[PDB]
Design a protein around this ligand. Structure first.
Ligand SMILES: *[C@H](O)[C@H](C[C@@H]1CCNC1=O)NC(=O)[C@H](CC(C)C)NC(=O)OC[C@]12C[C@H]3C[C@H](C[C@H](C3)C1)C2
Ligand SMILES: *[C@H](O)[C@H](C[C@@H]1CCNC1=O)NC(=O)[C@H](CC(C)C)NC(=O)OC[C@]12C[C@H]3C[C@H](C[C@H](C3)C1)C2
Lengths: 300, 297
C-alpha cells in the first residue's frame, strides 16, 4: 500500500571503497579501473572554509591516496579532478562492475541512496530531489561519497554523490561528473537553499494511484489549460508542470482514462477548497515523493 | 528516514522455483533451497490443500530451480511446517554467514521483494502486534524474505506467503511456522485487533526531538502504570520496564526522561496533533525501534 521502496543495493555495494588522505576518510565508487569520490578528501580542517582545490591537488601525488576495498589496498596510478569529483585511476578493474551509466536527474525525481561509512554500507533508502536541489537524507560524518542511483533492467544509473549538509538539516551533492545540483559549492560555509515547493507531477502521480485503487471522490467534471494550472499552482507553492511532466504521466493517464489536464483540474480544486475533512489513500496530506514510475512499480 | 539494510547479501541467495505453472521465489543457502510449500499447489489446490497428500505425489524432477539462466538439479526434498526444503547438487558460493530467527511483535526487519527469482525492491517492515506486516507484495512475491544484518551475519526472520482482505500480509519464519493465526490456504482470513507499538512511537518522538522538532513536548509527567492505563485505552501496547531501559540512550542524548516523553505522548493521544506534523507525518509512526533510531542517530 505504498511503501518507500528502494532498489536492491547489491550492485552498488559491490562498487563501494574507502578513500583516505591522512586521517580524512570518505567513500568512493569503484567502476572498471577508476575510483570516483568527493574532492574535499584532499582538504585539511583549515582548507575547508575556502579551499583552493587546484593548489591542494598540485600538492598531492598518487602515493598520498589510500584506496581500500575492505582492508585490501588498491594501488593508485593516476589522479585528476573533474568539477567537484576526484578520479583516481587504479591498477585493478573492479570484477563486480555492473552495467552502468552516469545520469543527471531532474528535481522531483527519486533515487535510492546507499549510505556508507568507511567504505561499508549501512543502509539504503529512497530520496526525492527537491525542487530547490536538496535531499532530505540521513547522513552523518563520514558519509560523503555515498551515492544515489536507479536500476533499469541490468543497468545502474548513478545520479548523486553526497558532499555536504546545509544549516537547515538538508543535504546537497553532485552528479558523477562532479557538477552540483543547485547553487551550492563544496566549501564549509553556510549556504541557503531556495524556498522549497511541492512536486506537482508527483502529487498527480499519487492521485492517479488513488484512482487505480478505487479512491476517486476528487475527480471533477472540468479541465484546465497547462498554463492556467501553472499560474494557480505557484500561488500554492506548487512547482509548475513541464512538458516532460505531462509526458511522464502518460502511462498513468492511459491506465485510468483520465487525461492529465483533467487530473490537473481536480488537483486545482483540491488546492482552492481543501480536503473538506476527507482523505485520499488514507491520508489528509498529499504525497509528493512518489514519481509516476514509482507508482507503476508498486501498483502493477 | 525509513532505512533498510543493504540487500546484497540476500540478493545472492534468491532463485526461482517452479512446479507446474506455479512459480515463486526460493532462498538458496549452501546446498538447500527454502521456499513456500504452496509452490506444489495448482491454483485450484490453493483453495484448500492437503499438503502431505500433494507432496507425496511429487518427485524431485517436478521442481524446476533456476539461478538466473542456470538450472539447479534437485536431489532431495522435504517439508518443514509451511516451508519446502529442496536439496540441490550445487552449493551457493554467495551464501553469507546467516542464522534463522523468530522475531517478536514490534521488531523491524528489511524485506527484499522478489519476482521470478529476481530482486525488485527493499523496504523496512515491522512485525505488527497482531502478527501481520504492512507489506508491498504482488502476485509472484512469495518466498521473498525479511532479514536483519548484524556485522556480517544475516538473520532471516520472515518468508512471505499471503495477503489478507485488508491488504496486509502474512508469512512464516524460516522454520515454516506462521506468525499469527494464519494458514496457507487461499481463503479470506482476518487478523486480530492491531495495536500501536508504543516503545517505537516513543523512539520516533525522540528522533523528532534530535532533529529539532519539539512542539509536542510538555512539563507534565506520569508514572509508568498511569501511562500504561492511557496507552491501553487508545489501543497502544503496554510499555515495560525493559522498554524504558532500551530507551535510555535516547533519553540521555536528548536529556528528556522516558516518563517525561511518555507524558508528551499521553497528551498527543488525548488531544491529537491539531493538524500539525512530526517529522513530516500527520500520524504517529510506530515502525522504528529504539535500535533503528540509534543506528541512524
Ligand atoms: C562528508 O562526509 C561530510 C557530510 C556532512 C557531515 C554531516 N552531514 C553531512 O551531510 N561533508 C562535510 O562535512 C562538508 C565538507 C565541505 C564541503 C568541505 N561540510 C559541510 O557539510 O558543512 C556542514 C555545515 C552546516 C552549518 C554548520 C557548519 C558550518 C556550515 C553551516 C556548513 C557545518
Ligand atoms: C505468493 O506469491 C502469493 C502472494 C500474494 C498474491 C497477492 N499478494 C500476495 O501477497 N500468495 C498467494 O497467492 C496465496 C496462496 C495461498 C497461501 C495458498 N493466496 C493469497 O494470498 O490469497 C490472497 C487472497 C486475498 C483476498 C482475495 C483472494 C481470496 C482471499 C481474500 C485470499 C486472494
Amino acid at each position: 500500500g505504498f511503501r518507500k521502496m528502494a532498489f536492491p543495493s547489491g550492485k552498488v555495494e559491490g562498487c563501494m571503497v574507502q578513500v583516505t588522505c591522512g586521517t580524512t576518510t570518505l567513500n568512493g565508487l569503484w567502476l572498471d579501473d577508476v575510483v570516483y569520490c568527493p574532492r574535499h578528501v584532499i582538504c585539511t580542517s583549515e582548507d575547508m572554509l575556502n579551499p583552493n582545490y587546484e593548489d591542494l591537488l598540485i600538492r598531492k601525488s598518487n602515493h598520498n591516496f589510500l584506496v581500500q576495498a575492505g582492508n585490501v589496498q588498491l594501488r593508485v596510478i593516476g589522479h585528476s579532478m573533474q568539477n567537484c569529483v576526484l578520479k583516481l585511476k587504479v591498477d585493478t578493474a573492479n570484477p563486480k562492475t555492473p552495467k552502468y551509466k552516469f545520469v543527471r536527474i531532474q528535481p522531483g525525481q527519486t533515487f535510492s541512496v546507499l549510505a556508507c561509512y568507511n567504505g561499508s554500507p549501512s543502509g539504503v533508502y529512497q530520496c526525492a530531489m527537491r525542487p530547490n536541489f536538496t535531499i532530505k537524507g540521513s547522513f552523518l560524518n563520514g558519509s560523503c561519497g555515498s551515492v544515489g542511483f536507479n536500476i533499469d533492467y541490468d543497468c545502474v544509473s548513478f545520479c548523486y554523490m553526497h558532499h555536504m549538509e546545509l544549516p537547515t538539516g538538508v543535504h546537497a551533492g553532485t552528479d558523477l561528473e562532479g557538477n552540483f545540483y543547485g547553487p551550492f559549492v563544496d566549501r564549509q560555509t553556510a549556504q541557503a537553499a531556495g524556498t522549497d515547493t511541492t512536486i506537482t507531477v508527483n502529487v498527480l502521480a499519487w492521485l492517479y494511484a488513488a484512482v487505480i485503487n478505487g479512491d476517486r471522490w476528487f475527480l471533477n467534471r472540468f479541465t484546465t489549460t497547462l498554463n492556467d494550472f501553472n499560474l494557480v499552482a505557484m500561488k500554492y507553492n506548487y512547482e509548475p508542470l513541464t512538458q516532460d511532466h505531462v509526458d511522464i504521466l502518460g502511462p498513468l493517464s492511459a491506465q485510468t482514462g483520465i487525461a492529465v489536464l483533467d487530473m490537473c483540474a481536480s488537483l486545482k480544486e483540491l488546492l482552492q477548497n481543501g480536503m473538506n475533512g476527507r482523505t485520499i489513500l488514507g491520508s489528509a496530506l498529499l504525497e509528493d515523493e512518489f514519481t509516476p514510475f514509482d507508482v507503476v512499480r508498486q501498483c502493477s
